[PDB]
Design a protein around this ligand. Structure first.
Ligand code: KYZ
Ligand code: KYZ
Ligand code: MG
Ligand code: MG
Lengths: 450, 450, 458, 450
């Protein structure tokens, strides 16, 4: 209910609110989505403000009393004690200056409860600009999401898929190409392909980390580092690596590229989009294999969570669609920078951090509550394998290339199986027993598993 | 922390939660995004459950005391009193069955507090299925968002752009093509173009409403209407039209197309994506025309809300990026239906309803706090038009294209008007009077303004 | 290899080439894709230059013998006689001025072969600019593609789908929701849904034509109409509508909007993208229903079009559904390229026109041609596996619901369990549990378990 | 016309055509786009057919005289002598079966001219399927395009941008953030940022090559390798590496993943889409820097190729839009595989090969005919930097905020340098010396450049 005073008039701020006038003005300016920064973004901004205060204190630019108060207040924010103190819309000034100032004001208020006076700009924002802070917090959050959350979740899914690839190594079935009956495969072979797709997904995330982990901090307003110490960036990054354990964080290769563009987020989103494409194929194959039971393929049974509807495959395919959409928004913002600043950072941050979160959470649920509990309908799968087309090649050593070719042509002409065409042509004899025919054409042998 | 008993056993539900066991199971099954239904889809689910109870009562299928209890509870949900009673993630079973059951459970808990016992399935879900209700609610929410909120917001922006077009009718300036100087226009003419883009946007939204307003209700599980009265659909739609005033709501032309596909949302997103494209052009031009104050175009001054940064053009271009991403997600879900049900409905609903909300809110903000307060640097704009090499063409018939090109070169080098350069070069004679010069170089006449 | 002189040097030009120095400069400047304008864009540039000459002649601005030479030359271009004379890359100056000048030069060279000297700029480009012509030709081409080609092809597919809906009106089968067994439908009902998606697609194309048909012609360099007659736009549109029969063409509502933006192409692409979404669902369902035959759903048989495999000689694949789904993917890609160019205009001109024109006209062409092939080579010849589909419907646990009021929902569920376990029809299972008696005759069982009546067919 | 035959019977084929029955059926089945395989794709199919015949001959499965005839025919195809004999549409069967048979039939017809009888399926397609040959030919073409064409084109553009970064190292100018005047930078620093974007693009392409270079060859119909030698793939890949010098070509890690999905093309397209995003930023900035010559920024002059219109920036930004569109088509195909085969290969191949070609060709043109020739308006750039309100801040501690604001306002109004305004306002002596003024306002020192 309390009032504050701003160099354009009077500002009313809620009573239990640690934010001040600049934040309140941003609240009134951007009532667009009704959604603010996520826990991960707030955490990153607190981590960054603590590291900046630490470096400003080490360089003798900030009195140690003020630094200690900023560091303690920032630690509270990084630990999630103030997630309710960040009310600014995602759809704000495109630098993220509004959220940067929100962090400065909340730290100033937390410090005042402890008896220390901080200026949000001159103290909490010392050596920083309105323009190198929010992109840095974005890349911290995205790198933490990749390394600490997504990669382990994808590994859990990979390991679940790989476990089925081994458990079903000899569970023969019919191949399907173009949705049509094809030569035999095993259910384990198919799952070995799903596992490879997730393993390649982890490789793709790893491959983007050298650029995703680049931080703009130290570049200040335009990338030149004016009004910051020359080594501010390298010193702040070392504090962040030590606090977070994220060795993937690093100073930008080029301080102009790191502020004029967000290409690292565009690159990372392409890795997440590829994983969404992989997850769509895996999830679609799994719900088709589970389909029916009478009208479908009925190859496997999915665990029942809610005739079991494939509710986790539907959650996975819906997440994949969202990641594809978010990826388009990210590329659109990425392309539209101008001169020294890309001003799409809040929108790009929301979208990539959501894509990380959705893929992390759905991959773990898919792994644990769908893949791990799948059961194969082994006898049904063998009946499908025993209904696949056969080939004459494995008879060559027995009947010769010429008789084999005549078997092939007559089977095609009369729409008969290879097996029955061999019987009908009277080839069961010294060259070939019925047991020899059955060994040579065995559907597990045709799958070339063992 | 109260206890409830399901098929599969025990489940704890918060004390003050009005949802029951099936919602709490869905909370446990889908911890993916941490974002549930928006206030417009919760409202629509309420409007729909009220209308269904009305019709079941009208047809003598549901006891009137039970129908009255449903209608009273549904009106509270429609009025936004229970937005906190819908905790299920967007990324749920693709039919939206979980959120349909959430609505049925919340209505039964509200009715219970007024002394009336309702069965969530047998009473609140009477005549309905898990597959025709959620997409009906989605199309009610989207139609209401288009008619009641977006069209009026767009008309407000149209009227602000049109008002500036009139105020700046004679504000002559340099045209620009390929970013290069061109013959004269007025700011009014440019703003008349912006206004047409927004008027055409309203035409595009109106043009999608015949199909956006199609409702699946009555089609039950697969579109056949098995286990509903034959006229359930037309009765429920008529009650929704009577109660909401939305005459755009209609029973679907084909009950199978209305459940197998969500093509109406794909179509409406296309209109929203086109408006986003328009708004990007308008917002980009306005921030470029405000660029400066020294090294940019310096054509206009934007009202200062937060070096006056174009923060509302940034909000508008970020919203447009989000609408473009959401549009890609919607089309992806739309294409991937199978047989009798498209199972991407929760993801498509989130995206379409967000696109409507963002465009509505940012259009009003852009109109009121950017467009209405723009001010033109009238003298600068006319002096540059009068100094541009582009305007020497109408001198050619008096002094020839070679002397006209010398005038253009000296005017630019000396930063003089074309008029002053022609006088300084001693061209005023019988060949060319001062009055013929002023006629030939009348830049506002060159713009050909009404 | 004849040589020419531009206001900036000498340029070598092929001997049989009707283009001249500005076009040859554009050829050397933009070796990017190796693809130029399509027949439909060249036709529209010819129509436009012919109409402009007719109007300039009627207004006393262009000498009659010069106008007549332009009209004759422009008719040859519109008739597809010169599709080899437009070598400039699609990825050219973003106004399309290079292609505008290509048209003006080729007309000048055609007129020269009949003894008339035309100045490419002063005669063939009279009353026009480098900025209002190419987007006009783009919108002519797109409107013609929508009205004369896409809508008729979509109508042919609609009619083929609707004919199957009528033929299969009693072909009962189990519904599928979430890919799981559901209550009965008919294959005619499902095909009625596909028909409605195509009919809605035609409605979406129609709804965009009031803005797709808006032409910029007459707005000249910046939209103001400086250096054109005040009524040049309405006069040229009148001639184009009269000669083409394209009733949807009109002068832009706002001459600035018509050059600063290409929002009509973005709008129209959304309709094509929605059609691509519909065709994806239709084509996917059809290839699933054709799947197997032994390991798939085997609901229908697609006409055989070509051998599928040398390793599996009998195998035939759903090649038309695959062409349709691949076209749909291309339309979705093209749609993203069009929106991208549409958003990025500046001030008086959008400079993405050649790229947006390539993408929109290609989407029109691919959907037109694949729709006709899908209708003729796939839908028309489909056959239903009627006995298969009825057997599954009659054995479905989903159909026990109508027994509730005779034997109660618990005995109905037990019938479902036993049927599904013993691979029996519901009818037979009801019998094998001795439930025929006082509550339920054998005729009353046959009424309740009538799967076609449960589909509720009209 | 002549008569040819396949397993479905008799087909009329143009008398002179080198293709046979299956190609002609495909000509009639797929008249959709009117465009067929590109040179690069026909080249790869020829390389692969030759390598397969070499390995079949080395394993004693194919007669040396037949292998020689195939290798010679395949060489003519790879060289481009028969591009007119590949009439099949891009939009064909989704495995590329039709273009595989086109290659087999054309090789058979060429071999027949030389008096050798080859069966298109039994000899030219020995040990092969379409399912492994067409994606192998697609990944050979894409890997070649990446390594031999795109990376060298991007290196040329990087080197032109880096040459400018050096040439313009001391060309001081106004920074611009939010399109608004900011503290100084140099054109050199801006160009260093563009150079980094292109170097990072090269790093993105190199990071995708471990998976783009994976070939399916040897997996035959379903991934199992049925009807091929167990080492067919390792042997064919060694021949292709020897013949192409592309060490990036490798056996697939998993034979099922390599046929059930095309994730490597989706991944590579992501890299191309990021480069398009970068090139959009670079081209936009360059055309805005060239804007004018009177009413725009007038920072640089572009070389004149056709009011010098920025035609190469326009070509670059149109190419970028096409790469973004193609990228969406590729991802859509990538996701929609089923079981053992993704059947979007011809469409995904068209799009990713086009994206490689357009970026290759436009990057070389941009580097040579735009970047190399730019000239800077050095005096204008410095005068505006020296005249900008943004550089008054370092005076704050000598003259006070109020007087720094008055200096900035007078400098803008009079169009004077900040240095001359401070002198004109009488502030030298009291507040600071000339030596102090020249140190505080040195715009090249403020850019942190020397
Ligand atoms: C003179 N200071 S001012 O008024 O405050 C001012 C501010 C901003 C400006 O462009 C953003 C300009 N433009 C110009 O000086 C335009 C111009 N005219 N004539 C030339 O020969 C020339 C040469 C190179 C570059 C530009 C030009 C002038
Ligand atoms: C002076 N003719 S010129 O050199 O040929 C020229 C050309 C182009 C320009 O901007 C594209 C400019 N800019 C300005 O005049 C900048 C400017 N300075 N001071 C003012 O008080 C002012 C007020 C309103 C708008 C701009 C200003 C100047
Ligand atoms: Mg580490
Ligand atoms: Mg079956």
């Amino acid at each position: 209910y309390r009032i504050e005073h701003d160099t354009m008039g009077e500002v009313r701020v809620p009573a239990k609110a640690l934010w001040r006038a600049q934040t309140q003005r941003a609240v009134e300016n951007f009532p667009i989505s009704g959604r603010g920064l996520e826990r991960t973004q707030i955490r990153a901004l607190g981590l960054l403000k603590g590291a900046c205060a630490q470096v400003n204190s080490d360089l003798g630019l900030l009195a140690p009393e003020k630094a200690d108060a900023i560091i303690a207040a920032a630690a509270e924010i990084a630990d999630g004690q103030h997630d309710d103190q960040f009310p600014i819309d995602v759809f704000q000034t495109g630098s993220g200056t509004s959220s940067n100032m929100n962090t400065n004001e909340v730290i100033a208020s937390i410090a005042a409860k402890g008896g220390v006076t901080l200026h949000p700009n001159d103290d909490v924002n010392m050596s920083q600009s309105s323009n190198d802070t929010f992109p840095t917090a974005t890349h911290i959050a995205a790198t933490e999401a990749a390394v600490a959350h997504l990669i382990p979740a994808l590994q859990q899914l990979h390991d679940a898929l790989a476990a089925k690839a081994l458990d079903w190594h000899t569970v023969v079935k019919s191949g399907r190409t173009h949705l049509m009956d094809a030569v035999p495969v095993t259910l384990g072979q198919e799952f070995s392909g799903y596992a490879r797709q997730i393993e390649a997904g982890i490789e793709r995330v790893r491959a983007c980390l050298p650029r995703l982990g680049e931080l703009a901090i130290g570049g200040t307003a335009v990338g030149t580092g004016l009004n910051a110490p020359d080594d501010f960036g390298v010193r702040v990054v070392a504090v962040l690596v030590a606090q977070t354990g994220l060795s993937e964080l690093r100073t930008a290769a080029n301080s102009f590229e790191a502020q004029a563009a967000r290409d690292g987020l565009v690159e990372a989103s392409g890795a997440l989009r590829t994983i969404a494409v992989s997850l769509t194929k895996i999830a679609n194959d799994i719900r088709w294999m589970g389909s029916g039971p009478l009208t479908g393929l009925a190859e496997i049974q999915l665990p029942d969570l809610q005739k079991v509807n494939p509710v986790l495959p539907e959650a996975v395919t819906q997440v994949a669609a969202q990641v594809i959409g978010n990826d388009a928004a990210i590329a659109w913002g990425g392309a539209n920078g101008a001169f020294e600043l890309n001003v799409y950072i809040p929108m790009m941050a929301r979208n990539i951090l959501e894509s990380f979160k959705l893929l992390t959470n759905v991959s773990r649920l898919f792994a644990q509550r769908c893949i791990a509990g799948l059961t194969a309908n082994v006898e049904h799968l063998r009946r499908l394998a025993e209904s696949s087309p056969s080939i004459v090649t494995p008879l060559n050593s027995a009947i010769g290339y010429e008789e084999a070719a005549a078997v092939a042509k007559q089977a095609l002409k009369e729409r008969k199986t290879i097996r029955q065409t061999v019987i009908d042509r009277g080839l069961i004899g010294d060259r070939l027993s019925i047991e020899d025919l059955d060994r040579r054409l065995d559907v597990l042998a045709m799958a070339k598993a063992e």
